[PDB]
């Protein structure tokens, strides 16, 4: 995401002070995180006996239970990967590049079929099927998830803004740009201590509005304008913002500047979800995790029993 780190106020928070909170988890961010940090001794991804990567399933299961043991009730938010994904103020132009000049012509030679295999992989190790498998696992676990209309980080931010959850869990700071009141990092990966970022604190301390923060983000470069503007960093961008000339500069330097802004200010969201937890299907989890994905039986058994009691007691 946007490298705000060194430039915005934030504070380390203990797992204890996070007890009893509801959180919306940025699903894809979490999955990618598990894939890069949950690996073998040699840095190789976790895999079952068929050679399929199980890194994500491991984090989904154990990380989610770890959170519930500390009275942190999570709701998983996914992007809803399938084709259509228009972020309801997001149809005018792109979402990929299928619109114009995306290189369209006649050609389908040896390299074309060698390229046949040369696509799906683009979807990194985190494949749609793996993502679908993670959702299935959550259902078996009785853990609720939402398939956002488009960007999951936007859906999670909206849920937090509404007060349905206390914060958005993610390793990225981008949720702040969608108005998320709070973001908590380092829960999906615990190398460092949990870190809380309160949007109100960021704005008051830096003396800027959310709209100003988004401008700084645009200067630095968002997923919507990679590379940002002329190598300008946070300091220089913040300088232009405080001077009151940032907006004029961005209109000149960034095509579709207004469109990008609308993505953060007017994302497509949904109210169709539930934070309710359900009892876990112990048998189905064992079959999926142990039988089909070679997880250690003993460990899984112990955890599904603990998960059941947590939800039973929570509920
Ligand atoms: Mn992002
Ligand atoms: Mn995302």
PDB file of C-alpha atoms and ligand atoms in Angstrom:
ATOM      1  CA  UNK A   1       0.000   0.000   0.000  1.00  0.00           C
ATOM      2  CA  UNK A   2       0.985   3.638   0.512  1.00  0.00           C
ATOM      3  CA  UNK A   3       4.212   4.040   2.515  1.00  0.00           C
ATOM      4  CA  UNK A   4       2.746   6.278   5.223  1.00  0.00           C
ATOM      5  CA  UNK A   5       4.587   4.407   7.986  1.00  0.00           C
ATOM      6  CA  UNK A   6       7.415   6.775   8.919  1.00  0.00           C
ATOM      7  CA  UNK A   7       5.157   9.796   8.454  1.00  0.00           C
ATOM      8  CA  UNK A   8       1.984   9.265  10.431  1.00  0.00           C
ATOM      9  CA  UNK A   9       1.301   8.902  14.160  1.00  0.00           C
ATOM     10  CA  UNK A  10       0.694   5.351  15.366  1.00  0.00           C
ATOM     11  CA  UNK A  11       1.007   3.387  18.578  1.00  0.00           C
ATOM     12  CA  UNK A  12       1.907  -0.117  19.662  1.00  0.00           C
ATOM     13  CA  UNK A  13      -1.070  -1.787  21.329  1.00  0.00           C
ATOM     14  CA  UNK A  14      -1.002  -4.971  23.402  1.00  0.00           C
ATOM     15  CA  UNK A  15      -3.133  -8.000  22.501  1.00  0.00           C
ATOM     16  CA  UNK A  16      -4.807  -7.486  25.878  1.00  0.00           C
ATOM     17  CA  UNK A  17      -6.071  -3.989  25.113  1.00  0.00           C
ATOM     18  CA  UNK A  18      -7.548  -5.433  21.913  1.00  0.00           C
ATOM     19  CA  UNK A  19      -9.665  -7.872  23.947  1.00  0.00           C
ATOM     20  CA  UNK A  20     -13.408  -7.752  23.310  1.00  0.00           C
ATOM     21  CA  UNK A  21     -13.153  -5.810  20.047  1.00  0.00           C
ATOM     22  CA  UNK A  22     -14.880  -6.618  16.773  1.00  0.00           C
ATOM     23  CA  UNK A  23     -12.723  -6.272  13.639  1.00  0.00           C
ATOM     24  CA  UNK A  24     -13.173  -6.440   9.878  1.00  0.00           C
ATOM     25  CA  UNK A  25     -10.253  -8.354   8.387  1.00  0.00           C
ATOM     26  CA  UNK A  26      -8.908  -7.330   4.981  1.00  0.00           C
ATOM     27  CA  UNK A  27      -9.087 -10.854   3.565  1.00  0.00           C
ATOM     28  CA  UNK A  28      -6.826 -10.636   0.534  1.00  0.00           C
ATOM     29  CA  UNK A  29      -4.256  -8.670   2.472  1.00  0.00           C
ATOM     30  CA  UNK A  30      -4.315 -11.392   5.115  1.00  0.00           C
ATOM     31  CA  UNK A  31      -4.028 -14.214   2.582  1.00  0.00           C
ATOM     32  CA  UNK A  32      -1.039 -12.690   0.807  1.00  0.00           C
ATOM     33  CA  UNK A  33       0.522 -12.135   4.245  1.00  0.00           C
ATOM     34  CA  UNK A  34       0.089 -15.815   5.209  1.00  0.00           C
ATOM     35  CA  UNK A  35       1.575 -16.891   1.891  1.00  0.00           C
ATOM     36  CA  UNK A  36       4.739 -14.877   2.406  1.00  0.00           C
ATOM     37  CA  UNK A  37       5.250 -15.473   6.162  1.00  0.00           C
ATOM     38  CA  UNK A  38       3.846 -18.978   6.775  1.00  0.00           C
ATOM     39  CA  UNK A  39       6.487 -21.176   5.185  1.00  0.00           C
ATOM     40  CA  UNK A  40       8.816 -24.109   5.787  1.00  0.00           C
ATOM     41  CA  UNK A  41      12.255 -23.891   7.385  1.00  0.00           C
ATOM     42  CA  UNK A  42      13.781 -23.181   3.968  1.00  0.00           C
ATOM     43  CA  UNK A  43      11.325 -20.418   3.104  1.00  0.00           C
ATOM     44  CA  UNK A  44       9.319 -22.755   0.896  1.00  0.00           C
ATOM     45  CA  UNK A  45       5.527 -22.407   1.080  1.00  0.00           C
ATOM     46  CA  UNK A  46       3.545 -24.868   3.178  1.00  0.00           C
ATOM     47  CA  UNK A  47       2.157 -27.663   0.985  1.00  0.00           C
ATOM     48  CA  UNK A  48       0.156 -30.862   1.340  1.00  0.00           C
ATOM     49  CA  UNK A  49       1.217 -34.276   0.019  1.00  0.00           C
ATOM     50  CA  UNK A  50      -0.109 -33.431  -3.447  1.00  0.00           C
ATOM     51  CA  UNK A  51       2.164 -30.408  -3.628  1.00  0.00           C
ATOM     52  CA  UNK A  52      -0.671 -27.870  -3.275  1.00  0.00           C
ATOM     53  CA  UNK A  53       0.021 -24.749  -1.221  1.00  0.00           C
ATOM     54  CA  UNK A  54      -1.699 -24.777   2.188  1.00  0.00           C
ATOM     55  CA  UNK A  55      -0.048 -21.660   3.621  1.00  0.00           C
ATOM     56  CA  UNK A  56      -3.316 -19.657   3.455  1.00  0.00           C
ATOM     57  CA  UNK A  57      -5.522 -22.334   5.024  1.00  0.00           C
ATOM     58  CA  UNK A  58      -3.062 -22.554   7.961  1.00  0.00           C
ATOM     59  CA  UNK A  59      -3.263 -18.828   8.699  1.00  0.00           C
ATOM     60  CA  UNK A  60      -7.036 -18.653   8.241  1.00  0.00           C
ATOM     61  CA  UNK A  61      -7.624 -21.481  10.720  1.00  0.00           C
ATOM     62  CA  UNK A  62      -5.001 -20.843  13.414  1.00  0.00           C
ATOM     63  CA  UNK A  63      -4.881 -17.050  13.146  1.00  0.00           C
ATOM     64  CA  UNK A  64      -8.661 -16.764  13.410  1.00  0.00           C
ATOM     65  CA  UNK A  65      -8.777 -19.042  16.490  1.00  0.00           C
ATOM     66  CA  UNK A  66      -5.838 -17.144  18.023  1.00  0.00           C
ATOM     67  CA  UNK A  67      -7.927 -13.957  17.732  1.00  0.00           C
ATOM     68  CA  UNK A  68     -11.083 -15.542  19.198  1.00  0.00           C
ATOM     69  CA  UNK A  69      -9.165 -16.913  22.179  1.00  0.00           C
ATOM     70  CA  UNK A  70      -8.521 -13.253  23.019  1.00  0.00           C
ATOM     71  CA  UNK A  71     -12.156 -12.228  22.617  1.00  0.00           C
ATOM     72  CA  UNK A  72     -11.426 -10.547  19.268  1.00  0.00           C
ATOM     73  CA  UNK A  73     -14.402 -11.281  17.038  1.00  0.00           C
ATOM     74  CA  UNK A  74     -13.407 -11.064  13.371  1.00  0.00           C
ATOM     75  CA  UNK A  75     -15.447 -10.843  10.209  1.00  0.00           C
ATOM     76  CA  UNK A  76     -13.543 -11.633   7.018  1.00  0.00           C
ATOM     77  CA  UNK A  77     -13.900  -9.304   4.050  1.00  0.00           C
ATOM     78  CA  UNK A  78     -13.095 -10.502   0.562  1.00  0.00           C
ATOM     79  CA  UNK A  79     -12.758  -8.630  -2.732  1.00  0.00           C
ATOM     80  CA  UNK A  80     -15.259 -10.727  -4.631  1.00  0.00           C
ATOM     81  CA  UNK A  81     -12.750 -11.548  -7.365  1.00  0.00           C
ATOM     82  CA  UNK A  82     -15.138 -12.683 -10.152  1.00  0.00           C
ATOM     83  CA  UNK A  83     -15.199 -10.467 -13.320  1.00  0.00           C
ATOM     84  CA  UNK A  84     -17.703  -7.678 -12.643  1.00  0.00           C
ATOM     85  CA  UNK A  85     -16.471  -5.676  -9.647  1.00  0.00           C
ATOM     86  CA  UNK A  86     -17.419  -2.125 -10.563  1.00  0.00           C
ATOM     87  CA  UNK A  87     -16.913  -0.040  -7.242  1.00  0.00           C
ATOM     88  CA  UNK A  88     -20.283   1.618  -7.837  1.00  0.00           C
ATOM     89  CA  UNK A  89     -18.581   4.975  -8.584  1.00  0.00           C
ATOM     90  CA  UNK A  90     -16.211   2.837 -10.637  1.00  0.00           C
ATOM     91  CA  UNK A  91     -17.461   2.113 -14.157  1.00  0.00           C
ATOM     92  CA  UNK A  92     -16.502   5.193 -16.180  1.00  0.00           C
ATOM     93  CA  UNK A  93     -13.099   3.874 -17.252  1.00  0.00           C
ATOM     94  CA  UNK A  94     -11.128   0.840 -16.067  1.00  0.00           C
ATOM     95  CA  UNK A  95     -10.599  -1.823 -13.405  1.00  0.00           C
ATOM     96  CA  UNK A  96      -7.921  -3.498 -15.504  1.00  0.00           C
ATOM     97  CA  UNK A  97      -7.417  -2.225 -19.066  1.00  0.00           C
ATOM     98  CA  UNK A  98     -10.060  -4.090 -21.109  1.00  0.00           C
ATOM     99  CA  UNK A  99     -11.369  -0.631 -22.068  1.00  0.00           C
ATOM    100  CA  UNK A 100      -9.111   0.880 -24.754  1.00  0.00           C
ATOM    101  CA  UNK A 101      -5.697   0.283 -26.367  1.00  0.00           C
ATOM    102  CA  UNK A 102      -5.184  -2.913 -24.350  1.00  0.00           C
ATOM    103  CA  UNK A 103      -3.429  -4.387 -27.413  1.00  0.00           C
ATOM    104  CA  UNK A 104      -6.037  -6.193 -29.526  1.00  0.00           C
ATOM    105  CA  UNK A 105      -5.191  -8.023 -32.757  1.00  0.00           C
ATOM    106  CA  UNK A 106      -4.734 -11.281 -34.644  1.00  0.00           C
ATOM    107  CA  UNK A 107      -2.014 -13.540 -33.263  1.00  0.00           C
ATOM    108  CA  UNK A 108      -1.978 -17.009 -31.701  1.00  0.00           C
ATOM    109  CA  UNK A 109       1.329 -18.792 -32.439  1.00  0.00           C
ATOM    110  CA  UNK A 110       3.603 -21.141 -30.406  1.00  0.00           C
ATOM    111  CA  UNK A 111       4.353 -18.332 -27.959  1.00  0.00           C
ATOM    112  CA  UNK A 112       0.626 -17.657 -27.822  1.00  0.00           C
ATOM    113  CA  UNK A 113      -0.013 -21.096 -26.352  1.00  0.00           C
ATOM    114  CA  UNK A 114       3.198 -21.002 -24.361  1.00  0.00           C
ATOM    115  CA  UNK A 115       1.505 -17.866 -23.074  1.00  0.00           C
ATOM    116  CA  UNK A 116      -1.625 -19.954 -22.623  1.00  0.00           C
ATOM    117  CA  UNK A 117       0.007 -21.155 -19.440  1.00  0.00           C
ATOM    118  CA  UNK A 118       1.289 -17.578 -19.251  1.00  0.00           C
ATOM    119  CA  UNK A 119      -1.661 -15.916 -17.488  1.00  0.00           C
ATOM    120  CA  UNK A 120      -3.434 -17.715 -14.632  1.00  0.00           C
ATOM    121  CA  UNK A 121      -0.105 -17.675 -12.799  1.00  0.00           C
ATOM    122  CA  UNK A 122      -0.330 -13.877 -12.835  1.00  0.00           C
ATOM    123  CA  UNK A 123      -2.907 -14.440 -10.138  1.00  0.00           C
ATOM    124  CA  UNK A 124       0.168 -15.337  -8.005  1.00  0.00           C
ATOM    125  CA  UNK A 125       0.097 -18.359  -5.693  1.00  0.00           C
ATOM    126  CA  UNK A 126      -3.116 -16.786  -4.354  1.00  0.00           C
ATOM    127  CA  UNK A 127      -5.479 -18.275  -6.924  1.00  0.00           C
ATOM    128  CA  UNK A 128      -9.263 -17.816  -7.147  1.00  0.00           C
ATOM    129  CA  UNK A 129      -9.672 -21.490  -6.205  1.00  0.00           C
ATOM    130  CA  UNK A 130      -7.454 -21.053  -3.137  1.00  0.00           C
ATOM    131  CA  UNK A 131      -9.435 -17.948  -2.208  1.00  0.00           C
ATOM    132  CA  UNK A 132     -12.673 -19.890  -2.646  1.00  0.00           C
ATOM    133  CA  UNK A 133     -11.213 -22.697  -0.453  1.00  0.00           C
ATOM    134  CA  UNK A 134     -10.447 -20.142   2.272  1.00  0.00           C
ATOM    135  CA  UNK A 135     -14.055 -18.939   2.238  1.00  0.00           C
ATOM    136  CA  UNK A 136     -15.244 -22.552   2.478  1.00  0.00           C
ATOM    137  CA  UNK A 137     -12.948 -23.145   5.438  1.00  0.00           C
ATOM    138  CA  UNK A 138     -14.339 -20.062   7.176  1.00  0.00           C
ATOM    139  CA  UNK A 139     -17.876 -21.339   6.615  1.00  0.00           C
ATOM    140  CA  UNK A 140     -16.895 -24.671   8.144  1.00  0.00           C
ATOM    141  CA  UNK A 141     -15.396 -22.718  11.028  1.00  0.00           C
ATOM    142  CA  UNK A 142     -18.651 -20.809  11.512  1.00  0.00           C
ATOM    143  CA  UNK A 143     -16.763 -17.561  10.938  1.00  0.00           C
ATOM    144  CA  UNK A 144     -18.638 -14.899   8.916  1.00  0.00           C
ATOM    145  CA  UNK A 145     -17.274 -13.300   5.768  1.00  0.00           C
ATOM    146  CA  UNK A 146     -18.397 -10.676   3.282  1.00  0.00           C
ATOM    147  CA  UNK A 147     -17.769 -10.556  -0.429  1.00  0.00           C
ATOM    148  CA  UNK A 148     -17.418  -6.833  -1.077  1.00  0.00           C
ATOM    149  CA  UNK A 149     -18.900  -5.289  -4.261  1.00  0.00           C
ATOM    150  CA  UNK A 150     -15.313  -4.427  -5.206  1.00  0.00           C
ATOM    151  CA  UNK A 151     -12.343  -3.502  -2.990  1.00  0.00           C
ATOM    152  CA  UNK A 152     -12.411  -5.419   0.272  1.00  0.00           C
ATOM    153  CA  UNK A 153     -10.417  -2.725   2.059  1.00  0.00           C
ATOM    154  CA  UNK A 154     -13.178  -0.275   1.129  1.00  0.00           C
ATOM    155  CA  UNK A 155     -15.912  -2.564   2.418  1.00  0.00           C
ATOM    156  CA  UNK A 156     -14.016  -3.137   5.670  1.00  0.00           C
ATOM    157  CA  UNK A 157     -13.479   0.584   6.135  1.00  0.00           C
ATOM    158  CA  UNK A 158     -17.206   1.262   5.645  1.00  0.00           C
ATOM    159  CA  UNK A 159     -18.099  -1.355   8.275  1.00  0.00           C
ATOM    160  CA  UNK A 160     -15.676   0.268  10.704  1.00  0.00           C
ATOM    161  CA  UNK A 161     -16.934   3.756   9.917  1.00  0.00           C
ATOM    162  CA  UNK A 162     -20.496   2.590  10.652  1.00  0.00           C
ATOM    163  CA  UNK A 163     -19.430   1.254  14.033  1.00  0.00           C
ATOM    164  CA  UNK A 164     -20.197  -2.374  13.237  1.00  0.00           C
ATOM    165  CA  UNK A 165     -16.538  -3.152  13.960  1.00  0.00           C
ATOM    166  CA  UNK A 166     -13.866  -1.287  15.917  1.00  0.00           C
ATOM    167  CA  UNK A 167     -11.159  -1.433  13.264  1.00  0.00           C
ATOM    168  CA  UNK A 168      -9.876  -2.863  10.018  1.00  0.00           C
ATOM    169  CA  UNK A 169      -7.158  -5.495  10.341  1.00  0.00           C
ATOM    170  CA  UNK A 170      -4.503  -5.195   7.635  1.00  0.00           C
ATOM    171  CA  UNK A 171      -0.765  -4.711   7.031  1.00  0.00           C
ATOM    172  CA  UNK A 172      -1.488  -1.760   4.736  1.00  0.00           C
ATOM    173  CA  UNK A 173      -2.368   1.800   5.741  1.00  0.00           C
ATOM    174  CA  UNK A 174      -4.717   2.287   2.765  1.00  0.00           C
ATOM    175  CA  UNK A 175      -7.899   1.690   4.811  1.00  0.00           C
ATOM    176  CA  UNK A 176      -7.297   5.146   6.285  1.00  0.00           C
ATOM    177  CA  UNK A 177      -7.844   6.639   2.815  1.00  0.00           C
ATOM    178  CA  UNK A 178     -11.371   5.184   2.757  1.00  0.00           C
ATOM    179  CA  UNK A 179     -12.162   6.862   6.037  1.00  0.00           C
ATOM    180  CA  UNK A 180     -11.499   3.857   8.286  1.00  0.00           C
ATOM    181  CA  UNK A 181     -11.426   5.349  11.807  1.00  0.00           C
ATOM    182  CA  UNK A 182      -8.945   2.744  12.985  1.00  0.00           C
ATOM    183  CA  UNK A 183      -6.515   0.277  11.441  1.00  0.00           C
ATOM    184  CA  UNK A 184      -4.608  -2.376  13.387  1.00  0.00           C
ATOM    185  CA  UNK A 185      -1.484  -3.929  11.875  1.00  0.00           C
ATOM    186  CA  UNK A 186       0.647  -6.943  12.855  1.00  0.00           C
ATOM    187  CA  UNK A 187      -2.082  -9.362  13.887  1.00  0.00           C
ATOM    188  CA  UNK A 188      -1.852 -11.521  10.729  1.00  0.00           C
ATOM    189  CA  UNK A 189       1.941 -11.542  11.177  1.00  0.00           C
ATOM    190  CA  UNK A 190       3.310 -11.022  14.655  1.00  0.00           C
ATOM    191  CA  UNK A 191       7.001 -10.328  14.005  1.00  0.00           C
ATOM    192  CA  UNK A 192       6.355  -6.918  15.519  1.00  0.00           C
ATOM    193  CA  UNK A 193       3.803  -5.767  18.075  1.00  0.00           C
ATOM    194  CA  UNK A 194       0.215  -4.979  17.096  1.00  0.00           C
ATOM    195  CA  UNK A 195       0.042  -1.399  15.851  1.00  0.00           C
ATOM    196  CA  UNK A 196      -2.971   0.887  16.002  1.00  0.00           C
ATOM    197  CA  UNK A 197      -3.469   3.866  13.698  1.00  0.00           C
ATOM    198  CA  UNK A 198      -6.339   6.223  14.560  1.00  0.00           C
ATOM    199  CA  UNK A 199      -7.364   8.384  11.585  1.00  0.00           C
ATOM    200  CA  UNK A 200      -8.543  11.252  13.802  1.00  0.00           C
ATOM    201  CA  UNK A 201      -5.131  11.310  15.460  1.00  0.00           C
ATOM    202  CA  UNK A 202      -3.306  11.290  12.106  1.00  0.00           C
ATOM    203  CA  UNK A 203      -5.335  14.255  10.821  1.00  0.00           C
ATOM    204  CA  UNK A 204      -5.125  16.354  14.014  1.00  0.00           C
ATOM    205  CA  UNK A 205      -1.391  15.748  14.482  1.00  0.00           C
ATOM    206  CA  UNK A 206      -0.495  16.522  10.852  1.00  0.00           C
ATOM    207  CA  UNK A 207      -3.093  19.298  10.627  1.00  0.00           C
ATOM    208  CA  UNK A 208      -4.777  17.915   7.505  1.00  0.00           C
ATOM    209  CA  UNK A 209      -8.155  16.631   6.275  1.00  0.00           C
ATOM    210  CA  UNK A 210      -8.892  13.146   4.931  1.00  0.00           C
ATOM    211  CA  UNK A 211      -9.109  14.755   1.478  1.00  0.00           C
ATOM    212  CA  UNK A 212      -5.564  16.181   2.041  1.00  0.00           C
ATOM    213  CA  UNK A 213      -4.249  12.737   3.125  1.00  0.00           C
ATOM    214  CA  UNK A 214      -5.678  11.226  -0.076  1.00  0.00           C
ATOM    215  CA  UNK A 215      -3.819  13.897  -2.079  1.00  0.00           C
ATOM    216  CA  UNK A 216      -0.541  12.986  -0.321  1.00  0.00           C
ATOM    217  CA  UNK A 217      -1.346   9.364  -1.198  1.00  0.00           C
ATOM    218  CA  UNK A 218      -1.966  10.257  -4.829  1.00  0.00           C
ATOM    219  CA  UNK A 219       1.387  12.132  -4.991  1.00  0.00           C
ATOM    220  CA  UNK A 220       3.214   9.153  -3.546  1.00  0.00           C
ATOM    221  CA  UNK A 221       1.268   6.825  -5.804  1.00  0.00           C
ATOM    222  CA  UNK A 222      -1.786   4.632  -5.217  1.00  0.00           C
ATOM    223  CA  UNK A 223      -2.829   1.321  -6.797  1.00  0.00           C
ATOM    224  CA  UNK A 224      -4.682   3.621  -9.200  1.00  0.00           C
ATOM    225  CA  UNK A 225      -1.663   5.681 -10.259  1.00  0.00           C
ATOM    226  CA  UNK A 226       1.503   3.578  -9.735  1.00  0.00           C
ATOM    227  CA  UNK A 227       4.664   5.635  -9.511  1.00  0.00           C
ATOM    228  CA  UNK A 228       2.736   8.638  -8.253  1.00  0.00           C
ATOM    229  CA  UNK A 229       3.916  12.093  -9.238  1.00  0.00           C
ATOM    230  CA  UNK A 230       7.462  13.009 -10.301  1.00  0.00           C
ATOM    231  CA  UNK A 231       9.148  11.046  -7.517  1.00  0.00           C
ATOM    232  CA  UNK A 232       7.561  13.303  -4.894  1.00  0.00           C
ATOM    233  CA  UNK A 233       7.638  11.719  -1.433  1.00  0.00           C
ATOM    234  CA  UNK A 234       5.512  12.247   1.692  1.00  0.00           C
ATOM    235  CA  UNK A 235       7.418  15.322   2.938  1.00  0.00           C
ATOM    236  CA  UNK A 236       7.225  17.207  -0.362  1.00  0.00           C
ATOM    237  CA  UNK A 237       3.607  16.210  -0.941  1.00  0.00           C
ATOM    238  CA  UNK A 238       2.607  17.275   2.584  1.00  0.00           C
ATOM    239  CA  UNK A 239       4.442  20.548   1.895  1.00  0.00           C
ATOM    240  CA  UNK A 240       2.349  21.196  -1.236  1.00  0.00           C
ATOM    241  CA  UNK A 241      -0.824  20.243   0.610  1.00  0.00           C
ATOM    242  CA  UNK A 242      -0.195  22.637   3.512  1.00  0.00           C
ATOM    243  CA  UNK A 243       0.576  25.356   0.960  1.00  0.00           C
ATOM    244  CA  UNK A 244      -2.829  24.973  -0.639  1.00  0.00           C
ATOM    245  CA  UNK A 245      -1.621  24.202  -4.172  1.00  0.00           C
ATOM    246  CA  UNK A 246      -1.706  20.378  -4.091  1.00  0.00           C
ATOM    247  CA  UNK A 247      -5.053  20.070  -5.862  1.00  0.00           C
ATOM    248  CA  UNK A 248      -4.064  22.275  -8.808  1.00  0.00           C
ATOM    249  CA  UNK A 249      -0.823  20.302  -9.090  1.00  0.00           C
ATOM    250  CA  UNK A 250      -2.596  16.919  -9.098  1.00  0.00           C
ATOM    251  CA  UNK A 251      -5.150  17.980 -11.719  1.00  0.00           C
ATOM    252  CA  UNK A 252      -2.183  18.830 -13.977  1.00  0.00           C
ATOM    253  CA  UNK A 253       0.042  15.877 -13.082  1.00  0.00           C
ATOM    254  CA  UNK A 254      -2.501  13.084 -12.669  1.00  0.00           C
ATOM    255  CA  UNK A 255      -4.998  12.200 -15.397  1.00  0.00           C
ATOM    256  CA  UNK A 256      -8.259  10.960 -13.839  1.00  0.00           C
ATOM    257  CA  UNK A 257      -7.314  12.644 -10.560  1.00  0.00           C
ATOM    258  CA  UNK A 258     -11.037  13.223  -9.890  1.00  0.00           C
ATOM    259  CA  UNK A 259     -11.823   9.611 -10.690  1.00  0.00           C
ATOM    260  CA  UNK A 260      -9.203   8.297  -8.249  1.00  0.00           C
ATOM    261  CA  UNK A 261     -10.573  10.565  -5.515  1.00  0.00           C
ATOM    262  CA  UNK A 262     -14.069   9.212  -6.112  1.00  0.00           C
ATOM    263  CA  UNK A 263     -12.748   5.661  -5.649  1.00  0.00           C
ATOM    264  CA  UNK A 264     -11.772   6.517  -2.056  1.00  0.00           C
ATOM    265  CA  UNK A 265     -14.653   8.859  -1.244  1.00  0.00           C
ATOM    266  CA  UNK A 266     -17.446   6.955  -3.038  1.00  0.00           C
ATOM    267  CA  UNK A 267     -16.661   3.260  -3.063  1.00  0.00           C
ATOM    268  CA  UNK A 268     -19.257   0.575  -3.785  1.00  0.00           C
ATOM    269  CA  UNK A 269     -20.182  -1.074  -0.471  1.00  0.00           C
ATOM    270  CA  UNK A 270     -22.858  -3.341   1.015  1.00  0.00           C
ATOM    271  CA  UNK A 271     -24.897  -3.761   4.178  1.00  0.00           C
ATOM    272  CA  UNK A 272     -25.728  -7.386   3.404  1.00  0.00           C
ATOM    273  CA  UNK A 273     -23.646  -9.281   5.953  1.00  0.00           C
ATOM    274  CA  UNK A 274     -23.771 -10.628   9.495  1.00  0.00           C
ATOM    275  CA  UNK A 275     -21.284 -10.561  12.349  1.00  0.00           C
ATOM    276  CA  UNK A 276     -22.931 -13.621  13.903  1.00  0.00           C
ATOM    277  CA  UNK A 277     -20.751 -16.649  14.628  1.00  0.00           C
ATOM    278  CA  UNK A 278     -21.972 -20.227  14.167  1.00  0.00           C
ATOM    279  CA  UNK A 279     -20.790 -23.487  15.715  1.00  0.00           C
ATOM    280  CA  UNK A 280     -17.934 -25.139  13.750  1.00  0.00           C
ATOM    281  CA  UNK A 281     -18.437 -28.303  11.686  1.00  0.00           C
ATOM    282  CA  UNK A 282     -15.677 -30.270  13.420  1.00  0.00           C
ATOM    283  CA  UNK A 283     -15.866 -33.203  10.986  1.00  0.00           C
ATOM    284  CA  UNK A 284     -15.751 -31.093   7.843  1.00  0.00           C
ATOM    285  CA  UNK A 285     -12.766 -29.139   9.131  1.00  0.00           C
ATOM    286  CA  UNK A 286     -10.864 -32.358   9.873  1.00  0.00           C
ATOM    287  CA  UNK A 287     -11.614 -33.728   6.421  1.00  0.00           C
ATOM    288  CA  UNK A 288     -10.642 -30.535   4.653  1.00  0.00           C
ATOM    289  CA  UNK A 289      -7.559 -29.752   6.752  1.00  0.00           C
ATOM    290  CA  UNK A 290      -6.257 -33.175   7.843  1.00  0.00           C
ATOM    291  CA  UNK A 291      -7.621 -35.626   5.278  1.00  0.00           C
ATOM    292  CA  UNK A 292      -7.367 -33.428   2.212  1.00  0.00           C
ATOM    293  CA  UNK A 293      -4.625 -31.015   3.204  1.00  0.00           C
ATOM    294  CA  UNK A 294      -2.351 -33.018   5.459  1.00  0.00           C
ATOM    295  CA  UNK A 295      -2.641 -30.882   8.566  1.00  0.00           C
ATOM    296  CA  UNK A 296      -1.599 -32.621  11.796  1.00  0.00           C
ATOM    297  CA  UNK A 297      -4.648 -34.430  13.161  1.00  0.00           C
ATOM    298  CA  UNK A 298      -3.885 -33.927  16.837  1.00  0.00           C
ATOM    299  CA  UNK A 299      -3.345 -30.177  16.439  1.00  0.00           C
ATOM    300  CA  UNK A 300      -6.451 -29.693  14.332  1.00  0.00           C
ATOM    301  CA  UNK A 301      -8.611 -31.806  16.660  1.00  0.00           C
ATOM    302  CA  UNK A 302      -7.464 -29.799  19.657  1.00  0.00           C
ATOM    303  CA  UNK A 303      -8.176 -26.528  17.900  1.00  0.00           C
ATOM    304  CA  UNK A 304     -11.602 -27.349  16.455  1.00  0.00           C
ATOM    305  CA  UNK A 305     -12.613 -28.415  19.975  1.00  0.00           C
ATOM    306  CA  UNK A 306     -11.344 -25.096  21.335  1.00  0.00           C
ATOM    307  CA  UNK A 307     -13.024 -23.178  18.482  1.00  0.00           C
ATOM    308  CA  UNK A 308     -16.348 -24.873  19.193  1.00  0.00           C
ATOM    309  CA  UNK A 309     -16.243 -23.976  22.896  1.00  0.00           C
ATOM    310  CA  UNK A 310     -15.212 -20.368  22.209  1.00  0.00           C
ATOM    311  CA  UNK A 311     -18.155 -19.822  19.891  1.00  0.00           C
ATOM    312  CA  UNK A 312     -20.426 -21.848  22.182  1.00  0.00           C
ATOM    313  CA  UNK A 313     -19.375 -19.659  25.102  1.00  0.00           C
ATOM    314  CA  UNK A 314     -19.200 -16.455  23.059  1.00  0.00           C
ATOM    315  CA  UNK A 315     -22.687 -17.262  21.810  1.00  0.00           C
TER     316      UNK A 315
HETATM  317 MN1  LIG B   1      -3.929  -1.533  -1.647  1.00  0.00          MN
HETATM  318 MN1  LIG B   2      -7.293  -4.990  -1.224  1.00  0.00          MN
END
